[PDB]
Symmetry: C2
Subunit: 362 residues, 2 copies
């Protein structure tokens, strides 16, 4: 009777018979890499997102690295990016020897404040990486206009936001290219590492396929210096099984999130009231007594994880960014904690979380 932050066994148990059937199918095929399962999943995910092309790759960090690589930007080219995202977003930029330009989020969305972007555009700016953090779509309209004004690419980091909708389009189809994680804890999660890239652009999709296959378009030839970043047939099959339920799963997460938003009332806690569509990958509360809170919940047998306690600019791997004054970002990092949420989470369990938080006197 410890309540786990995210019980993947529970989430995945509904599909066990299907997983096994597809695994046996793959065994029958004797094809485990770049086969029918990958094609099939790609086609179905591209349809889900409303895009022309989907390329399965190895994980969500590789998805962003590849996208950036394929644009073939110059050394020290600038990519604008929220300061409060998960570090992988920044790793993708610096791996490619681009310079990240870190922008404060809006305190009431946790996503990049669009009104703070233009002042930081320079003649070296080549792209804006938006991140739909925690499951909430970014307010894209201003960002798309800005990108057009200054001839910049929009790269969406969709790792946290599978299926969210801005006005008339899905996340994934709000920019020039989109990277997804299908890490097992994602809203659409694999049974292993996995990711993809989405795009409408024919040439970019062909370049990405090559770049993810050693740089080889054609057996024996390497047009580019590429890398090995592929989505295994088995993970593709698992993903495709689960994709048929993703809209349903997300709406169920919405139901749970709305219960929390409506039932948790504590002067010590700021709830993540959404300003745009939110698929609630993470249900993030904010409190001045965050470490006290995590211990309190642990004492009542409720497991929590912080997303996140150290922001990228303050990591030891980025000592050249440590000086940056980003107080909204820093404050968020000091105050946030994520509460358990999943599409299969039991009523007793979410009822318990709300009740226990309401009783909390700090």
């Amino acid at each position: 009777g410890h309540m786990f932050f995210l019980n993947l066994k529970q989430i995945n148990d509904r599909f066990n018979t299907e997983f096994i059937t597809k695994f046996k199918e793959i065994l029958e095929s004797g094809w485990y890499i770049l086969g029918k399962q990958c094609e099939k999943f790609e086609n179905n995910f591209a349809k889900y997102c409303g895009v022309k092309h989907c390329i399965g790759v190895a994980n969500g960090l590789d998805a962003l690295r590849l996208i950036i690589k394929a644009y073939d930007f110059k050394e020290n080219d600038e990519i604008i990016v929220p300061a409060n995202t998960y570090i992988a977003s920044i790793l993708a930029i610096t791996d490619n020897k681009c310079k990240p330009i870190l922008i404060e989020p809006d305190i009431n969305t946790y996503n990049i404040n669009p009104d703070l972007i233009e002042e930081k555009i320079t003649k070296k700016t080549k792209a804006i990486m938006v991140v739909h953090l925690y499951g909430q779509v970014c307010d894209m309209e201003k960002i798309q206009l800005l990108a057009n004004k200054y001839n910049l690419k929009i790269i969406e980091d969709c790792a946290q936001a599978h299926g969210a909708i801005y006005k008339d389009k899905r996340v994934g189809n709000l920019g020039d290219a989109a990277g997804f994680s299908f890490y097992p804890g994602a809203n659409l999660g694999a049974l292993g590492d996995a990711g993809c890239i989405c795009t409408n652009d024919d040439n970019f999709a062909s370049k990405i396929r090559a770049l993810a296959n050693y740089g080889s378009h054609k057996k024996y030839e390497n047009l580019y210096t590429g890398l090995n970043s592929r989505l295994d047939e088995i993970q593709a099959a698992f993903l495709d099984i689960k994709l048929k339920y993703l809209d349903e799963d997300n709406n169920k997460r919405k139901n749970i999130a709305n219960f929390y938003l409506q039932n948790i009332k504590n002067e010590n806690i700021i709830l993540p009231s959404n300003k745009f569509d939110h698929v609630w990958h993470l249900f993030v509360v904010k409190t001045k007594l965050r470490d006290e809170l995590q211990h309190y919940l642990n004492n009542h047998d409720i497991q929590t994880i912080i997303h996140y306690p150290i922001p990228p600019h303050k990591q030891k791997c980025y000592k050249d960014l440590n000086h940056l004054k980003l107080p909204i970002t820093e404050n968020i990092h000091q105050e946030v904690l994520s509460l358990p949420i999943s599409p299969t989470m039991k009523e007793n369990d979410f009822k318990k979380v709300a009740d226990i938080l309401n009783k909390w006197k700090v």
Copy 2:
């Protein structure tokens, strides 16, 4: 047709254990960095006779991460065979190091140790040896050069799982080793897979971190790392098959001996095994290579070339295209790989040799 490498035949031996372990993983609810990875790494370490194994995502990553971990300066030089698979070279260029390409010995298909020293400079930091097609490289002189010049030895073991040199396995012949477990490798996964082996405690720890976003500890990033991990599922399939690896290699040894004792065609140069050879690939050499591939295909025998375009001649490496590497070039024009796999049937290998003997040009 006869397939070049029939992975269904190779993997069928293990279906019931694969499905059992798959179900075990499902029951565990854990798919990344769990007990299956730990177990496989511990066993593969024991198998190579090394202290540490780090499961990573594929053989290129394995090499990229070893070089990344050394923290070489831009344009630092890495000595490497000119005739290896391009991924060996990609690992070096990805790290902004300069590949210094050395001709192989025609009698080994491996880097000629006698051609190394003359290419060492103040910028040389490493030698990447490749144990090509399954044969261990003649390390005696390479180790002496590495000691003399304070160079790292990086082994690319993607084609030579389990090969032996003196008292040691490939993987334990240098500072650090990368392996592929791509499904066609002598130990193959059902998906992309790799590992790194080393004896150095600090380096092993650094590699773990660098392959997990640069994080040693949850929430913290010491290094600007990558995501390159060996899935639980794959680790489990690997560990099931590892118990049969020496047996599988010996089955290859048998087929290669059949070929060697039975193919007698003046148009074909057969491979030799000067040192231990696990025969990942059984590479013949002819001036009429395209002709032979087509002839074999007419006779329902599938073959692949390893390889027909060398790294320096590739479009991606335009700045290398002018390099004069005639031994490597001639090998690329003339080599063809024959079907060999541990489960290959007697009638199939007999047919390959009979058909080669009948090739009359």
